[PDB]
Every structure is written in structure tokens, then in C-alpha cells.
Symmetry: C5
Subunit: 273 residues, 5 copies
């Protein structure tokens, strides 16, 4: 049938269908997703006053991101269950058109919140040295936006037009690398002046940042990571994608936020850990 510019999940769901395990796991992992976010929201709110006032905006922004992430992940969980329906006769879940096609694009647009805020918030914990606050912020926000928008466009074509898929992806990747560049600079400048304990944490933050953010373009490519008609162009690929997103989200948002708060505590004059 005629699906057009639609994510590959829909093509699997429309042809092969999803096994119990495939469908259920995807449902489960998305649910875990939004559960983590709302739990995180509570954590970040409840820990605000555990750091000096100047650092507390970081906590607040963590919270802001959690709200966004919860809402989107919740929506997406529902979208998954609405989009695919059990067929008694063969014992598989198939595309149910009246539920809408499943799209990952929900995620992408909500990054327009998450990415800017996640990048922003570290600038409230670390002091810069050579770099200007406004400069770093602006470069983060611009590169962040362009990364997301270009990617957002790409992913519509992940089946219908492999070329546009890869080209927009490439453009997106460029802006990604810039963000990586700037974050490294920031982290290095942040290390200057501060205790070895704080430096250790920033080291961890950078590792976490690097891995977790890289997962996202991984999820982009996931269906094609074993070439055409590979292992991953299948329900297994579908599962892998949503797993990676969920891991990425938890890491890039919650764990990131926790580490930052820990850093804030070491840099806090009153407070110990």
C-alpha cells in the first residue's frame, strides 16, 4: 500500500508485522522512557536547594527538560500502541491506519527544547575563561537548531528517498561536530580553577556527553547499519532504534543533569558530598 514519506517502522508493520516480543518490548521501553523522565523531574525539583543559589538555574533547567521529555515520550508511547494492532489469525501486530502512521518526528521537534537547554545549563555551573558566555550560548543554540531541523527533514525520507536521507543527515552531522567542538572547549575552561574532584566530574560529563549524543545519529541510521536488506531492516531494527533513543535520552538528560548537580555541589562553598 501507499505510505509515502513515512518512517520504516510503518513499512515493517504494514508488510511483515511485529511479533509479540517486538511490539511489546517497543511499548515497554518507551514507557520506561517517560517514567524515568517524570521521576527525574521530581529528583531535580527536590534537590534544588542542595547547591548554592548561583548554581540553582542548572537544577531548574534539568527540571524543564524532564517536563518536555516526559510529555513527548508519553505521546510517543501512545502513538506506538495506536499505530499497530493485533491480528488474531497470524498472531502479529500490523499497521492500523486509523491510528496515524508512527513517526519519530515528535522526538526531533521536542529536541528544539531539550538540546538548547542541556547545552545552556552547564554554563551556569562552570566558569568560562577565554570564551564569552553569550558567544558559546549563541553557537550552541544556532548549531543545535540547525542540527535538529536538518535531521528532522532527513528522517521523513529514510525509506522514500535514501539520498535526501543521507544528505540532510550529513548536513546535520556537520552542526553536531561543531557542538561537540564547543562543548569540549567549555569543559576544558570549566576545569581551570576548580578542585580535582570537580575536574574528575567534568571529565565524566564529557565522556557521557560524547557517547550519549552520538547514539542519536546511530538511531537515525539504525535501519541501514547492516546495509540494505540486513539484520536491522526488520522488527529487530525497530526495537534497536527505540532502545537506543531511550538509553540516549536517560543518559543525555537525567544522568547528565545528575553529574552537573554533583559538580555544582563540589563548587558550592557551604555544601559537601
Amino acid at each position: 500500500q501507499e505510505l509515502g514519506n513515512a518512517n520504516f517502522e510503518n513499512f515493517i508493520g504494514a508488510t511483515e508485522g511485529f511479533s509479540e516480543i517486538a511490539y511489546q518490548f517497543t511499548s515497554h521501553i518507551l514507557t520506561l522512557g517517560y517514567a524515568v523522565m517524570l521521576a527525574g523531574l521530581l529528583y531535580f525539583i527536590l534537590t534544588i536547594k542542595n547547591v548554592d543559589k548561583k548554581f540553582q538555574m542548572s537544577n531548574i533547567l534539568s527540571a524543564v527538560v524532564m517536563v518536555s521529555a516526559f510529555l513527548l515520550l508519553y505521546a510517543q508511547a501512545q502513538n506506538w500502541t495506536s499505530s499497530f494492532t493485533f491480528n488474531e489469525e497470524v498472531g502479529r501486530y500490523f499497521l492500523d491506519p486509523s491510528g496515524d502512521l508512527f513517526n519519530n518526528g515528535y522526538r526531533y521537534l521536542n529536541w528544539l527544547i531539550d538540546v538548547p537547554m542541556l547545552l545552556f545549563q552547564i554554563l551556569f555551573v562552570v566558569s568560562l575563561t577565554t570564551s564569552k558566555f553569550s558567544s558559546v550560548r549563541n553557537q550552541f543554540w544556532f548549531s543545535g537548531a540547525m542540527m535538529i531541523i536538518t535531521g528532522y527533514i532527513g528522517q521523513f525520507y529514510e525509506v522514500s528517498n535514501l539520498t535526501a536521507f543521507l544528505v540532510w543527515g550529513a548536513i546535520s552531522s556537520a552542526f553536531f561536530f561543531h557542538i561537540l567542538w564547543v562543548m569540549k572547549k567549555v569543559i576544558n575552561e570549566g576545569k581551570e580553577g576548580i578542585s580535582p574532584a570537580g575536574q574528575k566530574i567534568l571529565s565524566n560529563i564529557w565522556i557521557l556527553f560524547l557517547i550519549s549524543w552520538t547514539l542519536y545519529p546511530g538511531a537515525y541510521l539504525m535501519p541501514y547499519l547492516t546495509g540494505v536488506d540486513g539484520f536491522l531492516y526488520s522488527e529487530d531494527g525497530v526495537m534497536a532504534r527505540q532502545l537506543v533513543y531511550t538509553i540516549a535520552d536517560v543518559s543525555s538528560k537525567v544522568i547528565y543533569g545528575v553529574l552537573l548537580g554533583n559538580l555544582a555541589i563540589t563548587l558550592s562553598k557551604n555544601k559537601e558530598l
Copy 2:
């Protein structure tokens, strides 16, 4: 098909239908909408005590507006997905009558909250000089109400009666210009007596106000901005409208509120931003 006094989205949806991208993007952008608002709610609550007590009503009113905006944008997101349903055979989303017709009128009525409050709240940060508090407030609230109500009437006719559409629109525009007038006065009087830092922020606030508020009549006209049977009288026009609304909403509510809070901080005796 007989649609009557209904928004043009429904006419597109009933005849041509919406592509995957058109339907999905509109869904996505509305979702981002309400997500931003709930995130904002948390921000404004959590930052109340970042300014002197006298300023804190501004924070509170920001929060009040966020609640309104969230609820409306959430409803509207749902209305969009209910109103248009996938057709397997042609691969487009078509008007589903049993979901109700899509109307933008939800937005308009909720402005009866937002507009009065957004105008009101600045009067808790800036001091007036030559203008009287109650006078400015009353002119804001009256002109605000009339602007919205006249617009609300107009938009019902955006297809069924181009003339009424444009006339009510024109009347609405008059009240808009008055509001612009008064806000300018307010901004200028607010600048007097206060630090250059604060003056800079009020300058930004005015620009933001001017652009963001102007977008709304833009969205009004959107379908017709390329004349009859133009580019924009189409799913592309539908997309444009909801994008512009979302940008307008984020700008006019969240960013506006942030800047005001920043101003409040500079004007705060204790706090040194």
C-alpha cells in the same frame, strides 16, 4: 460536501487531503507548543524568589498564562489528530467528520486570558511616570478584549465569506494598533530612572512584543497571503499557520516572560544577575 462557516484546514482536508509531512509536522509543532508551555510553567514557578517581592506578581502571571496556554495547545493538538484520518488507498489524511471540524477558535478564546495578563504583568515590573496605572490597565483590557472578540468572529468566515473575514479583521487591527501605542508609552516610561542594563532589556522586550504579536494577524491572513488559489491556499498554508502560531506563542509568552523576569532582577536591590 457542506462545511459551512469552518476554517480552511477543513476544506483542504476534505478535498486534497494532507500528505504525511503536512499532517505529521502540524501534529509535531502543536505538541512542541504545549510542551514548551508546561516547561515554562515550571520555570516561572521555580524562579519566583529570584526577584524582590514587589516584582513577584509578574512571575505569578507568567505562570498563570502558561497554564492557560498548555491546556489550550494540548486540546488543539488532540483536535488536529481527531479531525483528520489516514486513507490507506491514496496515502493521505482526510477530514474525519466524527472527530469534529478543526477550528482555530479554541486559541482565540484562550487569548481572553493570555492577552489581558501579558499586558497587565509588565505593570508590576516597570514604574509608570506620566501614565496612570488603572488607565493603562483598562485600555489594555478593553482593547485586548475587543481585538480578540472581533477576530474570533472574523475567522469563522475565512472561507465562507471573504468580506466579513476582512472587515472584522480590520476592526480587530484597529484595537491592535491602540495596544501597540500604549505598550510603547509604557516601555518608554519604564526606561526612565533605571539602569542602562534594564533599559537594554526593555528595548528587546519592545522588539519581541512588536514582532511576536504581529505574527498573529499574519496567521489570520495566512491562507490568502499569496492571493486566491496561491501557494498558501493549501496544506503548505495550513503548516505555515500553525508554525507561526507556535512561534508567536513561545515568543509572546515564554520569552516575553523570561525577559521581564530578567528586568525584575536588574531592578532588584539584592540581586546582581
Copy 3:
């Protein structure tokens, strides 16, 4: 069609149906309704500590009422959209039986919360002189209950039995007049001892009270206010009713609560307006 003891909305919906504007406006105005209430909830919570401790129960009760009002108005909004469904062929919304008949009775029973609390709460701001606190409270609560319950019974018969409609209404009206009586007494005793500023506010409160509360029996009668087979026995009447309710609710609950809080501030030794 066999509807029985049902509100007149259902008879309109079942015979003539509702135009786009009629259906949509009613939907919109009910939505505004509950949006205002949740916004109000936030306001009243966030402003508690803006008055002396002794006054703060008034804020708390405002909040309590908002919760009630939100829940009910939300339910009612949903009930409206569920009860009436678009017919493609004629382009009007008709009674959809599977959604339940629309009833205003939801509102009535929730007044069993709102009315007692709204009457109660003023007694925490004003001092009485000659009257006893418990006496005024008991008279409010008894008369309030009887007013609502008798009205609640009446409105079931607003179509099926004009006689019972008017008789129960009349009985209800009696208790209403008593409440008006007592509130006047309270307002007068409240004015004694206190600044001209406070007296002004109580004057406004009384006007607001008188008008807003009177709207409710107006809504009761609405369908018949232009006699049999009049303008108002129609979708226009339906619209009028729900508009009036929404205006009444906002006025009698939110604005009322705001004014009371303003009064509390003037009567607060520490706090200024």
C-alpha cells in the same frame, strides 16, 4: 425521539442540530471556563503569603473552589463534544445518543462545594460586629444547599414539565433571596472599622456578588426568556446559557476571590497596595 426529563440542548440537538458556530463556540467557551479555573488555582496558591496569616484561609478556600470548578467544567466540556456529532450531509452537529444526553446537572451538584465555600470564605477577611460567625455560616450553608438541590430538581423538567420547572425554581429563588439578605448584612458589618480603601473594595464585592449570582437563575430560565418559540428556544439560547454560566463562574469565583485577597491586603498591617 424519546428523551424524557432532559435539558433543552438535547431537543435542539436532536431536531434542528447545531451549526458549526453554535457547536464550536459552546465548545470554546466551556474550554475557556475550565482553563480560567486552573489558572486561578495557581494564582490563589501562589499569592497565599501576600496577606497576614489570619486571612490566608480565604486564599486556601479560593484554591479549593478552583479545583472543584476546573474538574466540573472540564467534565462538562467533554460531555458537550461527546453528546453532539457532525453530520456530513447537512453540515450540522446532531445528538449522538451513545455519548449520553447533555445535562447541566453536573454544574449544579458541584455548587454544593462552591457556594458554601464562597460564602464561608469572606468571613475570614471581614470582621462581623453584631452578627455571630457560626450563625451567618449556618444560614449561608443551609440556604445554599436548599437553593442548589431545589434548582437541581427543577432543571430536569425544563422541557418535560414547565410547571415543576417554575415551581422548584421559585422555591430555589426564595433561598437565594435569603442568601442575598445575609451577604448584605455581612458586607455592611465588614465595612465598619476599616479604611475607605477597604470599604470601596467591599462595595465592589457586593455589586459583583449581586450581578454574578443573579446570572445563574438567568441561565436557568434562558430558553424561555423570549417566551415559547422565541429567539432563545434555539441554538442561540444554548450558546447564551453556557456563555452566561462561564461569565457567572469567572465572576463569582475568580474575580470574587481576587477582590477578597485585595481586601485582605489592605487589612494586612505589613502589606500595601
Copy 4:
């Protein structure tokens, strides 16, 4: 129709059906139910600091109970509307199987929270004299549990097996009487040492306790209180049941909690009424 071990509501709904008034009132009263609970939640949270720290657990437990009650009453409201559907032809609501059968059992199991907590909480306001805290608590909790569980079993048979109905009921009643016994003891010991104002309140609390708690076994029996084929074995009986539950719930939870808080205030060294 084959209904089995089902509540009598379903038998009425399946045979006679429910009139507009019967269906609507039941819907309305259940809605009022959960509305009161959520309002109560807000009240109890907002008033925590109105008593000395030692008393504040009582407030907290009130809040705990409200959350439980809200959730259950909300669910139950939805269950009612899902279980019974309008039939255009005769103008009555009939059992809709696809909505599930209506069961009161939701209520019963949620008492496993409410009852233990309601009994517990008074022990944080009153001082015992002869009786030990842990002893009273344990007897409350055991007797409470057994009361509920035995009742829960009974009510499944309220139609299918009048004998089991009455026997399990009887067993339940035994545990009830014990609870009554212990609460009386507690109330009497609580009166010793404390002001006449406090004693008055505890007297009221005992009356409230006795009446409100007794309503619950009343609701149990309701359908049969006028014998076989009586007034009450009918939609009128259905209405009566849910009314009584709602009155019982408001009384046993909210009003009870309010009185306790009032008592706490009199017993507070810092605070006056």
C-alpha cells in the same frame, strides 16, 4: 442475559434500564465525590503548618487518604458512564457489556488504604491514658482489614447468593463493632486532660464517626432494605446507594479530617482558632 456474581446495578441496567434522572444523578453524585476529594487534598496540604509539628502527621494522612479517594472515585465515575449506554428508542440507559459490568468492589479494596489511615491518624492528635498506641493501632488495622476483605467477598454475591451475602456481611459487621468499641475508648481517653473546646470537638468527631461509618453497611444492604421486590430494588435503590457512599465518603474522610485539624489547633501551644 448471563451476569453471574455481579452487583445489582447491572441487573437493573440489563432488564429495566435507567431513566435519564437515575443515570445522570448517579453520574453527577460520583463526580461530586472525586471533586470533593481533590479539593480536600489541596486543603489538607495547604493547612499542614496551621498546627504544631507533632500534629502535622494527621494532616499528612488526611492528604494521603484524599489521593486514594480521588483516584478510586474518579475511576468509579468513569466505570458508571462506560457500563450503561442510552437507547434512543425507549429513552433509557441499558447495560453496555463492552464497558465491563459495574462493580462497587473498586471502593472496597481502596478502603484497605483509607480505613487503616483514618483510624491511625487520630492517634497523632489525642493522647491515650490507659491504652497503648501500638496496641490500638494494631487492633484497628487488623479489624479494619478483616472488615473490608469479608465485605468485599460478600458484595459479589449480593444477587447471585443472598445467603453468602448476609453471612460474610455478618462476619464483617462483627469486626466493625470491635472498631466502634476501640474508637469510643480512644475518644474518651482523648477527652481527658484537654480543654472543654477540644472535648466538644471530640464529641462531634465521635458522632460523625458513628453515623458516617454506619452508612457503609447501609449501602451494602441498600437494595434489600425494603425487602424483596421493594421500592429500593430498582434504579431508586441504585441512586440511594451511590448517594449514601458519597455522603459517607465526604463525612468519614474530609469532615472527619477537618475536625481533627481543628482539634489539633486547640491542642497547639502556638496556635489559636
Copy 5:
């Protein structure tokens, strides 16, 4: 019918169906489940400042766990969606359009709960010989593996008894390790502290041991009376969800309460 790798609830629901009592009780007990969790959330938040600042992370983590609400709520809805009344025979049968019922929701949400529940005690007790990071890491790794292996197993609880039991066994191994470490922790926690505190830690260990053990009980539940036994039936379905609910309340709420009580005794102010 063709159900595949699906939980046994679905096989009961598809063949025999569920009586009013079976269906309703399961609905009721799951509802109680999530109600308790939301109530608990409020309790733990409202009691944070009842202990010294250093202990307050334990309260916060209790709150975080009260995850449980969201999952139990979802699961309640899943139950009612998955099984629909048949008027003709008066039983509830599998309704395919609602999805098959899976317990897997629970399992994956443990990936939150278990790590946090294990973690949080380390904010109340002082260790002696053991290192904080060491205990944490062993908890978190063993916790994850326990859940993941179990999660895989339960898919096969009907379709493949062998895989069911094998993955279960592997899971059990990691469980025993967690038990081991928790015991160590409890013992080290007792050292140096008041008799009041020691008493509470004793209770905590008992509660931990019983409540956590219930979970593998629920795993096996359908087969605890052998093939075609009492429990391979709607009665078994009921038993499972009851045990989960008891386990959840115990392992989360009561656990959290006791910990807070311990925190209070150890509090100087």
C-alpha cells in the same frame, strides 16, 4: 488461536475466559496498586524535612520510586483493555484489539525501582569494611541482569517452558548475589548505632527478604501446582497480580517508611 510468545493470562482469557470475580478482582487489585503508590509519593515528599539533611536523599529516592504509579496505572488500563465481557456466556475473553496483556511493563520499570531501592539505604546506614561505590556497582549490575534475564524468560512462560526455567535460573543467581550484598550492608549498618536503629534494620532485612522473594514466586505462579494444576487458571492469574501488588507495597512503600524511621533515630536534630 495464535498467540505466540505471550503471557499465560492471554491463554486463559482466550480459551476459558475470566469469571466476573476473576476479572474484577484483578482490576481492583491493580487499581489499589497504583493508588498506594501515589499516596506514598505524597507521604514521602511531605515527610522529607522530618530527618537530617544528609538522610533526605533517601526520602527523595522513595518519592522517585513511587515510577511505580505510572507503571501500575498503565498495567491496570492494559488489563481492562485486553479482556472484554461476552454477554452470551457471562465471562471476559481476550479482546485482540486491546493488545495482549503482558507483565513485561512491570519488569522494565524495575530497571528504575530496583537500582534506586538498593541505592537509597546507602544514604542512611554507614558501611564499615565495604566501599560505597563497590556496593552500589554490584547492586546496579546484578539488579540489571536479574531484571533483563527475567524479562526475557517471562515471554516464554507458555511457549517454551525450557527457556522460561533457564533464564529464570540465571535471574535467580543474580538475585542471590543481591541478597548476599544487602545482608552485608545491613550488618555493617548495625555496627556503631543505637539498639533502636539495629531493631529497625533487622525488620528491614526481614521485609526485604520476604517481599523480594515474592517476585520470583509470581514468575512461577502458573506452574506452582504443576502442569494443569489449581493455579494454571484464572485463580493463578489472580494470585500472580495479588502477589505483585503485595510485593510492590512491601518492597517500596513499607521499605521506604522503615528507612525514614531509621533516618529519624540516626538524626541528631
